[PDB]
Design a binder for this molecule. Structure first.
Ligand SMILES: Nc1ncnc2c1ncn2[C@@H]1O[C@H](COP(=O)(O)CP(=O)(O)OP(=O)(O)O)[C@@H](O)[C@H]1O
Ligand SMILES: Nc1nc2c(ncn2[C@@H]2O[C@H](COP(=O)(O)O)[C@@H](O)[C@H]2O)c(=O)[nH]1
Ligand SMILES: Nc1nc2c(ncn2[C@@H]2O[C@H](COP(=O)(O)O)[C@@H](O)[C@H]2O)c(=O)[nH]1
Ligand SMILES: [Mg+2]
Length: 443
RNA sequence: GGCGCUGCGGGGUUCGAGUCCCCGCAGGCCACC
């Protein structure tokens, strides 16, 4: 398994075959015909226009260039009108920038309105850079399509492809820029082994410097970090992957993993062995797009996690999951039970003013002096993490994300033990606890 | 929708809050292509 021959075996996994290429061409041809009939200005961009889309993931991006004077409302109205007119079937769903997702002759297509700017220094809609990304790249990426494909496939197989909040990984465009900068997939991997959280890759200037954060300077706009939404942890995972790959290259790095079914009894024994409190907050998923939902789930987890820390249940990690109907916030804590009694610090013996007040409070036990200060024994409201979270979620729902909190307000429950193992959260549980041998790349 | 630093303020906790928790006010970025 020489490094060179793994890469050629990997091409069979990332390069699309002829049936798929042909399906795209036919869809492309039919799209042009429909848009030409409407006499609107448009431009094919993205991975389809540069021939760098992954096998099995054919999608065509078509942009509509509208005059800059148009209001955001006019952009939306005209964009959606033309999108619906050009597509066989369609769905409209988005967080802020309007567009139309649909199908043409079996192929998936995004029709996206934007403003026809000259120069993208100061943009008016969030997508206005994309036509300029295409112009900058089209000449510099020829002959390197398969290198880009290898990089995307590599990232995708390891769950860090895509810059959307569900993933917080590497966008496709980002991949194309890395290939332009390093020349190939192998050189990107080799150099990535030495990236740090301070690395700044400036493709237009052809240099690597250091900065305050991991920054990939967009060649069409020096203020834009193309890796803005790449999390520190996924930056780390990738660097670690590149190091592992060179050490011992394998085709397995390009093979997707999937979770294995874990019998609830195996999970039970695993939790018993660990001796921790494992539990979940279950509630109804709000009907909102992934890009609104996941940051709220992230927020709600962190808020409850931080509550657990300061209440001394010593939480280990947290995770979350959205099924079709329910969201789950998962937790593991070292403490299943804490004493009802704790100690609160009082004033120095010196000032009888504050001492007299500190002692005036009626308690079940006598305060005491220790190391020159007064102290008292107080009693906790709850003594298990499940009790604490029940109280916390019932009264601090409003701080758990706009839509997530509102849902928690109407209903939630704390689930644990084997009832939790019957819920669709085993993969998140295995990942969170670091369970060995719970995934497989087997086909 | 999520995410700022500092400043002003309300409230809770506390013997004691500039410091911990909750909320408001005042000086763009990211995701959806
Ligand atoms: N988060 C982002 N950051 C920077 N550019 C983005 C972007 N999302 C979309 N774009 C731009 O819009 C183009 C198409 O976006 P997408 O269809 O979502 C991914 P793609 O570039 O087509 O590759 P892919 O289909 O293999 O995933 C990109 O090439 C890029 O120019
Ligand atoms: N009343 C009271 N004052 C304290 C206590 N601990 C520290 N301080 C005071 O708070 C100040 C902190 O600023 C210190 O100068 C100290 O005098 C305490 O437990 N009780
Ligand atoms: N007023 C108040 N201050 C606290 C409490 N717990 C911690 N602190 C803060 O902890 C700080 C410790 O600093 P110190 O005063 O001991 O030098 C104090 O300034 C104090 O304000 C509390 O319950 N009440
Ligand atoms: Mg695409």
């Amino acid at each position: 398994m020489k490094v060179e021959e793994i890469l050629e075996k990997a091409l069979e996994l990332v390069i699309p075959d002829e049936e798929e290429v042909r399906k795209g061409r036919e869809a492309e041809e039919e799209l042009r015909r429909r848009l030409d009939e409407l006499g609107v200005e448009y431009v094919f961009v993205g991975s389809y226009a540069r021939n760098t889309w992954l096998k099995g993931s054919l999608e065509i991006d078509v942009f509509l260039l509208f005059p800059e004077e148009f209001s955001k409302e006019e952009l939306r109205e005209r964009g959606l009108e033309i999108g619906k007119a050009v597509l066989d079937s369609y769905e409209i769903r988005y967080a802020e920038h309007p567009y139309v997702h649909g199908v043409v002759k079996g192929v998936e297509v995004d029709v996206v309105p934007c403003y026809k700017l000259k120069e993208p220094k100061n943009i008016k809609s969030a997508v206005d850079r994309t036509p300029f990304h295409h112009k900058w790249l089209e000449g510099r990426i020829k002959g390197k399509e398969n290198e880009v494909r290898l990089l995307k496939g590599f990232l995708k197989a390891n769950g860090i492809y895509g810059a959307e909040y569900k993933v917080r990984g590497f966008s496709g465009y980002l991949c194309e820029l890395l290939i332009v900068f390093y020349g190939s997939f192998l050189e990107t991997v080799k150099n990535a082994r030495r990236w740090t959280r301070r690395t700044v890759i400036d493709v237009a200037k052809g240099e690597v410097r250091k900065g305050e954060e991991f920054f990939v300077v967009d060649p069409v706009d020096e203020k834009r970090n193309v890796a803005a939404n790449l999390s520190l942890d996924n930056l780390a995972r990738f660097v670690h992957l590149c190091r592992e790959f060179m050490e011992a290259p394998s085709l397995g790095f390009f093979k997707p993993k999937h979770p294995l079914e874990i019998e609830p009894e195996r999970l039970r024994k695993i939790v018993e062995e660990r001796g921790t409190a494992v539990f979940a907050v279950k509630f109804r998923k709000p009907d909102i797009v992934d890009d609104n939902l996941y940051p709220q789930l992230e927020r709600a987890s962190r808020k409850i996690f931080e509550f657990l820390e300061r209440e001394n249940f010593m939480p280990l990690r947290s995770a979350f999951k959205a099924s079709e109907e329910f969201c789950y916030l998962l937790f593991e804590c070292q403490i299943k039970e804490i004493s009802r009694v704790f100690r609160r610090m009082g004033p120095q013996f010196e000032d009888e003013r504050n001492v007299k007040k500190f002692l005036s409070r009626n308690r079940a036990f006598r305060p005491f002096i220790e190391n020159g200060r007064w102290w008292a024994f107080e009693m906790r409201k709850f003594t298990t993490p499940e009790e604490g979270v029940r109280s916390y979620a019932s009264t601090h729902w409003h701080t758990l994300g706009k839509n997530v909190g509102e849902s928690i307000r109407e209903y939630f429950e704390i689930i644990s033990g084997e009832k939790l193992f019957k819920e669709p959260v085993t993969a998140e549980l295995c990942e969170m606890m670091g369970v060995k041998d719970s995934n497989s790349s087997s086909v």
